[PDB]
Structure formats: C-alpha cells, structure tokens
Write a protein that binds this ligand. Structure first.
Ligand code: ATP
Ligand code: ATP
Ligand code: TTX
Ligand code: ADP
Lengths: 500, 70, 480, 179, 478
C-alpha cells in the first residue's frame, strides 16, 4: 500500500505548491550561548516564535530599537551569522489532547519516551490569563494526600496552591509522589513537571509510576540540567497549559513543579545573557511576576465554568534552612500556605518531617470533610501550644499532674504522625486515628507500642466492621453512631492488645 | 545612542556652526523625568544656581556635564 | 488624541514610543496602544508616560500585558492621567487599575470621573482630632488603640495573619461604620479577593438585589497583573475614596492589602526604566513614592479617611526599606511575630514591638494607660528573663521572678482570641470582646486574682468569665 | 533607530529638507561615501593622534576641490569637531534610509534566477506601492541563481518583510510529507 | 581549503579573530592559531569558538598560553569540534586537555577519535538499576551508601581529606575493578599527578612494558594551566570514558578531582568573555555549564559510568553556587568537615550531612536501613545537646541524655577507620571492613553491650573485634 498513501500525498501536493504571505524575515547578527540578536524583523510580536536556518525555534523577547533580542530554544551551533530567520506568526502554542496521559514529554511537548507522537488537535497557548475574581469559587473539596499530618492539620484542597519547601533529602519529592499516587481512586489528572533534574531521577520516577499504576492519569513534563535555559523556563508554563486544558473541560487536576528554583535559576541566566540589569543577588526584578503569573492559574473554577479544578503543589529548596532567601520568600508569599520540611525532624526520626509550627494552610477546614473537621478542628493550635508546653517544661524540675498528662498526650500525638514511605492512609483510617489519639486512649501504652497498636486497630476495624467505612464514605460525617461503633472497636482492640 | 544628541540640536548646530558662540542666554529641555531634567545650553550657569523652567518650575543646576546641565 | 505615536521598543511592560516633533505626551498622561487580539480585532492596551527621554520618545509603562504588541504600532495621546469613575457608580462593583468593571455586570456610569494623579491636601486642610475606636480585639484595643481618622498599619511576613486580621477588622468595623468602606486590593491573591467578595455577598454588605445601595467598592490589583496595575491600583482606590471623602463628606474605611506590592512594582519597573539600583534593590524613587501614596491619604475637615492597611515584611526583617518607610507614615502600628504565630497564639500581634500614638493618658483614660503600661512591663520582664531561665533553670528564681513569669505566660495566653473569620482555622466560634471586658480581665490577671487557674484556661477565650469557665471545665476533666 | 549614526543622518536630512536641497545633498553624500571608502582618508580623519587643525585643513582642501553643499561641509566640520568621526561611514550609510523615509521612495529588492524586463519591474513596483503605500518605488536588481525558478522580493523600512517563491515550494512540499 | 582568518583582540585567553565575510566557524570549533615562538612554529596554540560578535568575526578562548600572540596571526578552522584520541590506544597513557600524550612515550593512534562536545544520552537509553556498592569505608558503607552506576561527591573544604579519601576509594575499588577506569584531574597538583602516576606504575596498573593492557587512562590539566584548558580537560576525560562505555560495552569508573576547578575556570573565562556576572562572581551559565558535564556521566543500557567526583567547597561554605548546583546533580554526597578533621576523627565525613539516595530498605536490607536510622537518630540527639554541653558539661544532663551522649561519643569514634593511603601520616596499618562487620559492630554499639568499653577503643580501628582487643590492651595497661 506504499503507492496509494503516496497517491494521496501527491493529490495533496498538486493542491499544496505555494501559499502567498509576507513572511517577516531578518538577518542574524550575534550568536552566543542561546541568545541571538537579530537584525530586521520589525513587524514581529512580543514572544513570537522565529524559525532559523537550522530549524531552531526562538522567542522574540526584547524588541530593541535596532535589533531584536531573541532567545534560542536549543543550541546556537549551526546558526550561521548572516543567515536568515523567519518569523512564524504564533505565540508559544503547544498541541494538547488526551493522549498525553502516560507520556513523559519535553518542554516543547515532544515525547522523549519514544512511543510515537501525540495525537493532539486542539492547541492552547503557553501563557494564558489567570481566572478572574468571578471565574472562581471558594475551595471546599479536600485533595487527599494520604499523609495523616497534611490531611489533618495543614489540609490541601481541590483548587489550592500549596508549597512544599525544605532542604535537601528531606522528602519533598517523596511527598509529591505520594500525593500523586494516592489519587488512583479519586479520578484526577496528575502532572509532574521536572525542571533541571537528573535524567536518572526522572527515569526512577517514571519507573515507580509505571509499576505502581500511576501512569494511567499522569504526564511528565521533564527536561534535565543539560537542557537550555529557555526550556527549563518554559517547562512549568507548558505543564500548566497541559493541565489547564483538562481544568477547563470539567476535570480535576494536580500539578507539581519539582522544582521551581531551577526554573527561576534558568530565567535568571537568560535574563543575564540578554544583558538585562540584575537586581538583588543577580535575580532580575520581575522574578516575582514570573512565579505569580504561573501560580495564579491554579484555581477552583465556578459552576458556570464547569467547576473544574487545578491544585498546584510546587516544590522549592531552601539552602541550610534559609527561608529568608529571595525565591523562598517569593514562593511562600504567592502560594496559599506552605509545608516546611526540616532535616532536623528528618534525622530525629520524625518522618515525613512536617514542621507544622511554621507550616500553614490558607483554606483550613474547607480542605477537609465534616468528619475530619469534627475530629481535628482545634488540633493544630493545641499541638503548637503543646509543643510549647513540652519545650518549656524542660526547665521546671517537677510538674503538676495536669501539665504532665497533657505533655504525655502530646508525645503520643507526636508518635501518631509518623508515616512511612509510599504509604497512603484513607479518610476512614485518618479519622479513626485522630479520634483514638486526641480522645486520650493512647495515654496509657508506651510511645513505641503506640504505632503497632494503631496498625492493629485499623486492621481490626477493616476485618470486623464495614459499616464504619460505609458511614464515613457515604455520609462523610463522624456521626454519634459511627463514634459508637468506633468506641466499641477501640475497647475490643485495647483488650486484645492487652491480653496479647 | 548618546544623550544631549537629539537630532534637533545637531540641526541647529549644522545651521549655526560657524564658530562656537556663547549660548548662555538660552537653554532647552532635552530629557525630563522623575524629578530631574537634562538641560542644554547655559554655559555660564554656576553650580547650585537656580534655573527657572518655563511654566514656573524652579530647578537647581547641580551637576554641570559636558554639554548638558543635570 | 490627534498626535499619533509609534511603538519603538518593548521590553516587557516598559515600552518606548516616538511621537511627532512638537506634539509629545505629558508625564503621567495615558496612552492607548492600538493592539491586536489574536483573532485580528484590536486589543487596546493602556500605558502611562513615565519619562520623556528625548528625541520625541517617551517611556511609558503598560498597565496591561505587553505580549502580542509589535513594533511600529499605533499609539494615541489621550491628554489626561488615568481617570477613574467616581461616586455612587462604584458602590458594589469590582474594578481594575483603569476603573473598568470586572464583576461582569452593567457598565458603570462614566459621568463622574476624577484623574488618579492629584495632589495631597494642604496643611490648613488637616483635621487634628484625636480619638480611638473600638475594634473588638483584646490586644489591639488595649495596647495599640487605633486612631479614628488616621492611618493604621499591619506588619509581618506571610502566613502570620495580617490578611486574617484585616478580615476580622473589616468584619467588626465595616457595618458599624455609618459611611462607605473602600477596599483597594494591591498585589493579593485572586482567591483571596474572591473569598472576600463571596463573604461580602453572603453577609449582605453589597446588597446585590439593589446595586447602588452597597456600602463598598472593590479595586483588585492581583498578582497575575503586570507591574503597572500593581503600581496603580492603590492610587485608583485612593482616588475613589478621596472623592468619597471630598464631596460626599462622610467617613471612609480604606483597607489596603497588600501595600508592599506597590513598592514591589515600583522596584520591578525602576531598573528597566533607566534608574540606577539603590540599596538592596528598591528604586531611588521610594521615599517619594510612599509619600505620593500616604500624604494623599489623609483626613481633612470635610471627610475622614480611616485606612487600615497591611504592610508585607520580606523575611520578617523590619530593616527592609519599604517596611522601614511605611513606619514613618503609620500612626498606629502592629507587628506580627512568627514566634507568636508559630506557638499557636493568634492573633500574633507582638505587643512590645507594636506601638500606637493614641496610648496617652489624656486620650485613653488613666486606667487604660496604667493597665497597658503594666502589661508591657510584665511582658518585657518576661522576655528579658526568658533566656536566663532557659539556661539556668526555673527553680532558682525569686518569688516575684517566678510569679511574674507565670503571670506573663498567662497574659501571653490571654492576648489570644478566637476570630470570627478564623473559625475554619481554630474550630471555636469568634468572640467580640469589648474594651471594658479586656481592661477588667487584664487588671485581674495582673493583680493575681486568677493566680491559681491553669494557663491553658486563658487560651482562645474572649472574656475573662469564659476563661474562668474554661478553668472549671479543665478542673472537672482532670477530676474525671 | 537610536544609533548616533541614525541621529546625525536624520539631522542632516532634516537640514537639507528644510532647505529644499535634498537631492543636492544626496549627491554630495554619494560622493562622500566614495571619499571615505579609501582607507587612508578615513584613518587620517579618525585617528586621534592626528591634530584637529590639519584634520580640518585637509578637510578644507577636500571641500574646495570636491565641492560640497554649504551645510554638508559645515556638518563634516561638526563631526571632526564633536568626535563622531568614527561613525562617518555609518552616518553615510544611515543617510540613505532617512532620505528614503523623508521622501517615500521605498527601496524593494527583487532577486530572481535571472534578470527581468521593465514590464515585470513595473508590475512589482505597482505591487509594492499598493501594499506599502510609498509615494515612490525604486527597485534594486540582484541575481540569485540559488533559486530554482521564480522571483523573490523584499521590502520594508529594513528588508524585513519578504515574499518568495522558488525553493520555498520545494521545502513546504517535502516537509508536509516528512512530517 | 579551510577558511583562514586573522586575530584582532588579544586579552588573555580571549582571542577575537576576524574571518572572511562569507564563511565563519560555528560554535565550539577548533581554531588553530599559527603562532610564532622563539625558533619556529608553535602550531599548538589551540582555541575554540565561543561566540559570534557580528561583522564577520568571532570570539575564542585559548586552551594554551596567549602571551606572544601579535595582531595578524593566521588562523585555520578545523571545521569539526575538538576531537581527542579514544579507545584502546589511550589505555595506560597520560593525556592533556588537548589529547596530546605528555606520557613521554610514543605517539597515539588517531584512527578513532571523538569530539569533546556531544549531546547527553537520551531518555530511552538510561537505566533504573538500583545497585549497592561497598567501599570498606565504614561511614560510607553505613550512613551514605554508594550507588553503582551513579555519580558520587566528596564535598569538603581545603585540607580536610578529599584527596586522601578518593585515593583510598581508588585503592579499594579500581584495583580489582573488572572494567576499565579513567582518571581525570581538572585542576589539581602536578605533585599529586606524579605521585598517582608513580603508584600506578609501581603497583603494576600502568604496565611499563606492554602498555596495551593497563585498564587506566590519565587525563590531566593541573592548576598552572590556563582557564581555557582547565575548563575542557574534564570534557576530554569524559569523552574517553563515554567512548569506553558506549562502544566497548564496559563499566567504567571516573575519578574527577575536582570539578570546582572546572567551575572556577568557567568563571574566569566568562568574566573575560564579557558576560554579565551572576551571583557574586560566577558565570551566568553556571547551571547549564555544570549540567552539560554531569548529564553525560550517567550510566546507559550498555555500560555503566560510576564516577566519584571530589568537590572543593569554597571558604567551607556549602551555600556557594558551585556546591549549591553540584549537590543537585550528584546521587550520593559525602560532606567532609574541617571540625572533625581537626578533632582527629578521620575520615572527616559529617555523618548527618552526607545523605545518599540509596539508603532505602528495598535496596540495602531492613537491618542495614534500621541500624542506619538509629545511628542517625543518636547522632542527631547529640548534635542537639551540643549547645547545652558546650557551656554546662555532660554532668547536667538526664540519665537518658547522658546515655545518648556517651553512645554518640562511642559511635562518632567508631565511624573512624585508618586508611591504607594514610598509613604514612598515621603510622597505623589501614583496615578494610565491609558491610557484614559494619552493620554488626554498629548493632552492638547501639545495643550497649560494649558500654563498659572506653571511647579510645573505637578510635582508629576497622572491626569491632579490633576495638575490643584495643580495649583489652587498655585494661592490660592497668
Ligand atoms: N514518609 C517517609 N518515610 C520514610 N522515609 C522517607 C519519607 N519520605 C522521604 N523519605 C526518605 O527521604 C529520602 C530523600 O527523599 P526525597 O528524594 O524526596 O528528598 P528530596 O527533597 O527530593 O531531595 P533533593 O533535595 O535531592 O531533591 C529518601 O531516601 C526516602 O527514603
Ligand atoms: N585518613 C586520614 N588519616 C589522617 N589524616 C588524614 C586522612 N585523610 C586526610 N587527612 C589529612 O588531610 C590532609 C590533606 O587531605 P587531602 O589532600 O586528602 O584533601 P584536600 O587537601 O582537600 O585535597 P586537594 O587539596 O587535593 O583537593 C592531610 O594533611 C592529612 O593529614
Ligand atoms: C607577568 C605575567 C602575568 C605575564 C602575563 N601572562 C599571563 O598572565 C598568562 C601566562 N596568560 C594567561 C597569558 O598567556 C598572557 N595573558 C595574560 O593574562 C597577561 C596578563 C598580565 C596582566 C597584567 C600584567 C602582566 C600580565 N599577559 C599580559 C601576560 O603576558
Ligand atoms: N486569628 C487566627 N486564628 C487562627 N489562625 C489564624 C488567625 N489569623 C491567621 N491565622 C492563620 O494564618 C494563615 C494564613 O495567614 P494569612 O493571614 O493569609 O497571612 P497574610 O496575612 O500574610 O496573608 C491561615 O491558615 C490561618 O491558619
């Protein structure tokens, strides 16, 4: 059938010979390390792609008086000085469709997995406006992470930005990966953008996803440290557009930027290669606008817009715990609450090392359900006040009994929040855990038997009583009836744990 | 890409170049923004001397540069 | 209008346009760039002349997105600063930097408009009355008595609670205020603005049923907008409120959030305009920028603009130039401390660093003054002692030393309060606490009546009878 | 264009315009170009070790012998005075464009495989004048055998805009198949 | 005919060459200045095109000295980037940044040669084989295990022990290494170079006769080399190693010492080239310049490159940009400390800071993982109590606090191990102790059966049995 497809191609050729159009084309002047000052090209837009002699795409950023500052989207090796470059007429369009589900792709939406090109008809711009004041509604659904700490104290909701900030090897990638992997039964679209990271790291992530099952609903917008600065800069915006395609069409999405500091570093690099003035510590002034323009597009759309959602969970890195740095303070300003991960809590055993004292969630109980709100509305303030009471009562020699019992219960609470790697907890387990903890049942048994007793109690309710899970699922409220069932179960399991 | 060279002053000099004549009687406003104004002419103005813009805006000649009075 | 310019250089929102020889726009005038929407129709992008830079060229900052705007495009010279519609056509309506309606409702009645860039009132025009109002927050109404008809300030990093504090203050003061409130949203989150709007709808403030019955006007300079809007939405909302105070001669509430983002936008736009960077990165025109905002915002004989505005502090450093500069213009200042926020004491108003100008005997009453001074004294003793205790131990202190330590911990608890809007954060209901109840409770806690109650009984309580009842509840819970 | 070359060139062109002697100056500029093309001339006139006096004296003798417009001689004295004399060749380059933009005589460059006739020249001149709106159209003729069979015209204030059809056809038809 | 050009600017390594109007060289092409030294033609002056500065001229950086180059030197264009000899001809030889054998022996065969500028391997050609590897260094084997196939970093200041540590690793591994190693020195001492070469000869690795079989190729650009050289010698060694990997299908080692001089050379070059400087002094393209190096080192589906890269941390500041960007790329980092090095606890690895990605039970076994977590716990608690004990002393602590502090003293001394290559400074014969004894010894120390022993019994020993024997000696000496 080689000739008949060639016959259709030739039937296209007789109708596709030439199109008349005033292609704006200019001469290349200076070519150095990804930036090319261009002569000519006076009717080009801002941010319009140009195509060089090599086929190298650019983006016309600085329309100076004489020349046109153009960033190359790749290498400038084969671009010869004086060779011509043609403008395209588009502004950072990317193809987008449902086929991207499962396909790790480059920042130009090119499949680096080699599994064929993506069937994408509709195209959405890379840069889009943020949803207005009336194009959103208040966040009310919860976005389950699986972690008891994040799911109870500092909750995250469908349509909220939440920053994962912390040091090296403090579990930020693991937090994001577990938050993605818990989505397997909630039907959301996952996006994991990787900006300036190890190719081997991305390979490990896509292997973990593919073998755990999280690739039926995930995309990976990755480019490594080798990739050009403009690709490291366009990766988050391309991931955002890919997510927003779903977000507008009545879907719930979840995008993670691991990490953002590499994007801001690449944008700083290209700003300094365009000879723009460097602001404080070599970062340009507009880096705040850079991050805010990207982040303000994650919202919870109103009913008229289909009540679509997009939860953005970006990841940044602080060096030696220096939150006072430029990009850390910029991101903790833009996002809607932040989750600080501390290497101190990491070494000391507290894993995942959520430092809730300096962690916040700007949605509150509206990023939980009625059951988890009833069980843990006051828990964050009480746990911070108990962190004080346990930190201050190291100075006093002897304590009065009320404070001693509050201190012991707070220590039990601290043993509850330990969560292993790759382990999600459902809403039923989370509610029953916070109940059996806060209500003072674990005040007796020791800090080390706490966790094993918790495991045994949840195993017990799973085997014996299904109506607890049925209630918290179908009704979604920690009713008096469900609490009656739960207290029966806790007493039975406490007696069993005693006799064993 | 130089200050003080506005392509109208070069016109006036091309007309009247014959020899370099005192121009302190006059003075023109080349660039004005954010509270300062670069001024041509005024070749005998002192440093610190009040210079009075038309429309009534007093100024002070702080740094006398090569061919422009900041 | 007739003199048409040509776009010459576009570097982000900092543009360069050339004009015919002798017809050049004026500084701060508005320019309309005849843009192009992606479908070929025009997309008008406004600008504002910043700097006449020679050879018929002017540098104007675009109040909109600069992408898509080619060189050599058409530009007009409107002949006026950015004018905004003022009066009763603003009540109940959400706006832009340019005064455009963005709540997707009827177009505003243009009829009354007033240009943004105007002068401050003169020295003879100042109202010199000194009086405090009741805000319903314990620490505020005791230690930082706000000045009715002045300028208040909320300082702190992010996540410490100045937006929630400004929401609490809106809740308490807006409806009791007999006049009109104004809210300028500057560099704040779109979902923050939307939640505020949904609350102003549900709480019946705007009275959506009858527009032009509302007592509120909304201007939002969100963070997605270019530096032009983040620069000028404060001045927009200020010109609206200034009309309200000028001719409608009624008291105004002017909540601003966030005010640091205005200086942020100035700093972003400065270096690209041509200015040399000053210290840590702010513009050279920082002091006069803050002047052109604050000194325009003042109370006069006709009207009184009460302005409760929140200053972001980058990395909790009050040495940062913009927080340092706002301090000189803000009468009553409150500083939020990450220690108080992190420990769980909310609101996190650092009391010893927070100061007002109203806390003077003749103005607040001798009893209120003496109790404020005693509270600050005990907290300062506690903080001057705290690290010595942390090293030494607690037993080795004298009777009065341990006594004041216990009382100061209890006072640190009692300056906390459940907020009306922070229900989703705390779980308890918000309590309005009166000044008499606060003064009485702090008098008791300082005199040592309650000197055996649990310190935790003083945590998230409105009144002092609530703290006694909570002590009763904990006492019974211990007996069970 | 904000280049000092363009600044001085536009100033000189506006001087000649307000006189009315635009073509008289343009001739002298064609002459000054081929003056300054010779390297000892430009080097002597540009290097600062050479005294400003004898610089201007050799300039006076060149004025007398060559013959220059009064204001153009005045202006080359201005360049020697104000030390833009390094930008002399660039000013004599930019004067062409500022003259074209004063006059409306837009230069459009056609390149075909071979030379073409006056009929096609007037056709492309009418095309350029109708699509640009320039009061005049003057056409440069350059041969380009790298094209296969077709004509390629550029235009614009710089040669930015362009329509072309020789090899563009081959590229667009091979790309739609090797997509 | 290669197009020929003259030189216009000479400012140190920066060379601006004017090239004919039509045919300019591309980025990274080998430019060869003719050169005229004292007697004859030193054609060795080699550049690479870095930019294109318009008006038919480009900017080059010199891989050699530039002093003596006058304006007007003829320059040829190679047309292809800088290509170095690869393959079996390179085994047992010393090369340059230029690939010219300075081994004072016969020439090298230019049959198969590889350019120094090659794109990173694709995403399909990587692998996800999680692989452990023991070194016999106790702290390395326990608190930051090393990954076969992945890059490893020796982050430390000056004079702390990165070179002794990497030499100990070389002795432990590259001897019995069944593959073929490549040692590249990016800006280190010529003394260290000569010492390593002498040891590679006398130990038999670089066979004196029969240089066809040596399994090691040296590529050296020392600290006296110009920045153009010290910026590309790493690329040279990298091309040799990736030839071995991609073509001969072998696993390769690559000890780089140390990449901070690569970064520094880059900064010295960029300041000359005239780019706007990034953070306080570094080049703007630091992240990309580092990543272009690093992402070519990862293992692929044919062979595996397990590179161990020392990194010099400036002024003992981990906040500086070159450490800040290398920490990201490396798989397992090992942070040395000047403090421990001064207190004598050698190697000077910071235990809590040196965090690997392979310390996961699925890779290392549950016992290894659990004992590693307990050691990290106890060392963390001692790090916390340090602030108190500094002023007070150990006397003021609780029973459990003083217990943890005593256990942490024993632990941080048992982490220490005498090395074979440090035997000239310590005098004590280095011990080799793997994982089977490492995990057991630490299990015992954290169980507290050995609580009766002093501290000095665990200092400078390999096995817990040698620790106990030293304890028996410390009780024989009454
Ligand atoms: N919930 C958890 N329980 C136990 N261990 C965990 C948990 N989360 C993370 N870890 C451990 O933390 C280590 C590092 O995790 P991770 O890679 O997420 O940190 P990171 O922030 O991505 O590091 P980098 O800064 O290099 O990107 C992993 O080896 C993993 O075993
Ligand atoms: N195992 C050890 N035993 C005793 N001393 C050691 C040991 N390792 C390192 N040292 C000390 O470290 C010093 C030098 O260490 P080394 O040269 O390995 O690191 P470096 O100076 O950072 O290397 P370079 O300067 O080549 O980058 C020596 O003075 C030596 O005393
Ligand atoms: C006295 C030494 C430094 C001579 C120089 N040589 C070098 O610095 C080295 C050898 N390099 C890089 C050169 O090849 C010459 N270029 C210079 O850097 C320099 C640097 C230099 C700067 C200031 C004073 C003297 C020299 N050359 C001038 C040199 O010839
Ligand atoms: N009165 C309060 N009670 C409890 N939590 C509060 C209170 N005020 C602020 N917060 C906490 O602060 C977090 C958000 O801080 P926010 O006010 O948004 O910071 P900013 O004022 O800088 O915007 C919320 O998640 C909330 O938990």
């Amino acid at each position: 059938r080689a000739d008949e497809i060639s016959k259709i191609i030739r039937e296209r050729i007789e109708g596709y010979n030439r199109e008349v159009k005033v292609v704006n084309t200019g001469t290349v002047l200076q070519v150095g390390d990804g930036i090319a000052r261009i002569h000519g090209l006076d009717e080009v837009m801002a941010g319009e792609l140009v195509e060089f002699e090599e086929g190298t795409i650019g983006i016309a950023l600085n329309l100076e008086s004489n020349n046109v500052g153009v960033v190359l989207m790749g290498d400038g090796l084969m671009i010869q000085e004086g060779s011509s470059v043609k403008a395209t007429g588009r502004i950072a369009q990317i193809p987008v469709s449902e086929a991207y589900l499962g396909r790790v792709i480059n920042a130009l939406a090119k499949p680096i997995d080699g599994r064929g090109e993506i069937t994408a008809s509709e195209s959405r711009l890379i840069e889009s406006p943020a949803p207005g004041i009336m194009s959103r509604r208040s966040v009310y659904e919860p976005l389950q992470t699986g972690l008891i700490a994040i799911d109870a104290m500092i909750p995250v909701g469908r349509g909220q930005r939440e920053l994962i900030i912390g040091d090296r090897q403090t579990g930020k990638t693991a937090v994001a990966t577990d938050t993605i992997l818990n989505q397997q039964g909630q039907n959301v679209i996952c996006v994991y953008v990787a900006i300036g990271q190890k190719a081997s790291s991305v390979a490990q992530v896509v292997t973990n996803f593919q073998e755990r099952g999280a690739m039926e609903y995930t995309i990976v917008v990755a480019e490594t440290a080798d990739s050009p600065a403009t690709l490291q800069y366009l990766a988050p915006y391309t991931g955002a557009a890919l997510a927003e395609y779903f977000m507008y069409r009545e879907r719930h999405t979840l995008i993670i930027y691991d990490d953002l500091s590499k994007q801001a570093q690449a944008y700083r690099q290209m700003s300094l290669l365009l000879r723009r003035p460097p602001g404080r510590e070599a970062y340009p002034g507009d880096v705040f606008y850079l991050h805010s323009r990207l982040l303000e597009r994650a919202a919870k759309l109103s009913s008229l817009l289909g009540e679509g959602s997009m939860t953005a969970l970006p990841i940044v890195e602080t060096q030696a715990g220096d939150v006072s740095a430029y990009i850390p303070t910029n991101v903790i300003s833009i996002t809607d609450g932040q989750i600080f991960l501390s290497a101190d809590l990491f070494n000391a055993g507290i894993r995942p090392a959520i430092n809730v004292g300096i962690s916040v969630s700007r949605v509150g109980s509206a990023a939980q359900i009625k059951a988890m709100k009833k069980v843990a509305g006051k828990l964050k303030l009480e746990l911070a006040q108990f962190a004080e009471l346990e930190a201050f009562a190291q100075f006093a020699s002897d304590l009065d009994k009320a404070t001693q019992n509050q201190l012991a219960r707070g220590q039990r609470l601290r043993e509850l929040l330990k969560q292993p790697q790759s382990a999600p907890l459902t809403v039923e387990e989370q509610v029953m855990t916070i109940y059996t903890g806060t209500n003072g049942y674990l005040d007796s048994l020791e800090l080390d038997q706490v966790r094993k007793y918790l495991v045994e109690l949840r195993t017990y309710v799973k085997t014996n009583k299904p109506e607890f899970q049925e209630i918290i699922s179908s009704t979604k409220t920690f009713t008096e009836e469900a609490e009656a069932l739960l207290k029966e179960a806790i007493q039975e399991q406490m007696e069993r744990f005693l006799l064993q | 890409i130089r200050a003080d060279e506005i392509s109208k002053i070069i016109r006036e000099r091309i007309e009247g170049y014959n020899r370099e004549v005192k121009v302190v009687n006059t003075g023109t406003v080349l660039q004005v923004g954010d509270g300062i104004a670069r001024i041509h002419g005024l070749d005998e103005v002192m440093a610190g001397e009040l210079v009075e813009f038309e429309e009534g805006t007093i100024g002070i000649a702080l740094n006398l540069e090569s061919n422009n009075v900041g | 209008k007739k003199n048409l310019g040509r776009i010459a250089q576009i570097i982000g929102p900092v543009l360069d346009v050339a004009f015919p020889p002798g017809k050049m726009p004026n500084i701060y005038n508005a320019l309309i760039v005849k843009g192009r929407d992606t479908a070929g129709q025009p997309m008008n992008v406004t600008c504002e002349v910043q700097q006449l830079l020679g050879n018929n060229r002017v540098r104007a900052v675009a109040m909109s997105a600069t992408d898509g705007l080619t060189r050599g495009m058409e530009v007009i010279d409107t002949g006026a600063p950015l004018s905004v519609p003022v009066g009763g056509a603003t009540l109940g309506r959400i706006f832009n930097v340019l005064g455009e309606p963005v709540d997707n409702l009827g177009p505003v009645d243009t009829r009354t408009t007033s240009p943004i860039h105007r002068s401050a009132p003169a020295f003879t025009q100042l109202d010199t009355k000194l009086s405090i109002f009741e805000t319903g927050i314990k620490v505020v109404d005791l230690l930082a008595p706000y000045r009715r008809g002045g300028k208040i300030g909320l300082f702190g990093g992010a996540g410490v609670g100045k937006t929630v504090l400004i929401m609490e203050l809106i809740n308490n003061i807006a409806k009791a205020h007999g006049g009109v409130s104004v809210f300028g949203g500057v560099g704040e989150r779109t979902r923050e603005g939307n939640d505020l709007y949904m609350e102003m709808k549900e709480s019946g403030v705007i009275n959506e049923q009858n527009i032009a019955e509302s007592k509120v006007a909304l201007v939002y300079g969100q963070m997605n907008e270019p530096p032009g809007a983040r620069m000028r939405v404060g001045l927009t909302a200020l010109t609206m409120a200034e009309y309200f105070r000028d001719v409608n001669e009624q008291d105004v509430l002017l909540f601003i959030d966030n005010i640091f983002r205005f200086v942020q936008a100035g700093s972003e736009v400065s270096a690209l305009l041509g200015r040399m960077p000053s210290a840590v990165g702010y513009q050279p025109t920082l002091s006069t920028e803050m002047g052109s905002l604050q000194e325009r915002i003042t109370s006069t004989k006709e009207g009184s603009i009460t302005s409760i505005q929140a200053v972001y502090v980058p990395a909790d450093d009050l040495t940062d130039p913009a927080p340092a500069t706002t301090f000189a213009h803000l009468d009553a200042t409150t500083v939020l401390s990450r220690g108080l926020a992190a420990k769980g004491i909310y609101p996190a108003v650092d009391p010893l660093d927070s100061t007002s100008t109203m806390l003077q005997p003749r103005i607040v009453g001798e009893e209120h003054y003496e109790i404020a001074q005693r509270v600050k004294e005990t907290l300062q003793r506690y903080k001057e002692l705290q690290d010595i205790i942390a090293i030494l131990g607690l037993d080795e202190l004298s009777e009065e030393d341990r006594l004041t330590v216990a009382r100061a911990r209890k006072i640190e608890r009692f300056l906390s309060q459940p907020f009306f809007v922070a229900e989703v954060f705390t779980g308890s209901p918000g309590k309005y606490v009166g000044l008499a109840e606060t003064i009485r409770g702090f008098q008791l806690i300082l005199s040592g009546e309650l000197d055996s109650l649990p310190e935790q009984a003083f945590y998230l309580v409105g009144n002092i009878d609530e703290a006694t009842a909570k002590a009763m509840n904990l006492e019974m819970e211990s007996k069970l | 264009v904000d280049s000092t070359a363009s600044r001085y060139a536009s100033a000189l062109a506006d001087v000649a315009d307000v006189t009315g002697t635009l073509e008289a100056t343009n001739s002298d500029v064609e002459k000054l170009i081929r003056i300054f093309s010779e390297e000892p001339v430009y080097y002597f006139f540009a290097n600062p070790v050479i005294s400003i006096d004898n610089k201007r004296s050799v300039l006076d003798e060149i004025i007398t012998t060559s013959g220059l417009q009064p204001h153009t001689a005045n202006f080359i004295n201005i360049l020697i005075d104000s030390e833009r004399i390094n930008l002399v060749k660039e000013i004599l380059n930019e004067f062409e464009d500022v003259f074209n933009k004063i006059t409306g005589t837009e230069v459009a460059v056609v390149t075909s495989v071979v030379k073409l006739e006056n009929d096609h020249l007037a056709q492309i001149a009418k095309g350029v004048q109708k699509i640009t709106g320039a009061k005049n159209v003057r056409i440069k003729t350059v041969i380009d055998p790298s094209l296969v069979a077709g004509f390629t015209i550029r235009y614009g204030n710089e040669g930015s805009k362009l329509v072309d059809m020789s090899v563009k056809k081959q590229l667009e038809e091979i790309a739609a198949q090797l997509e």
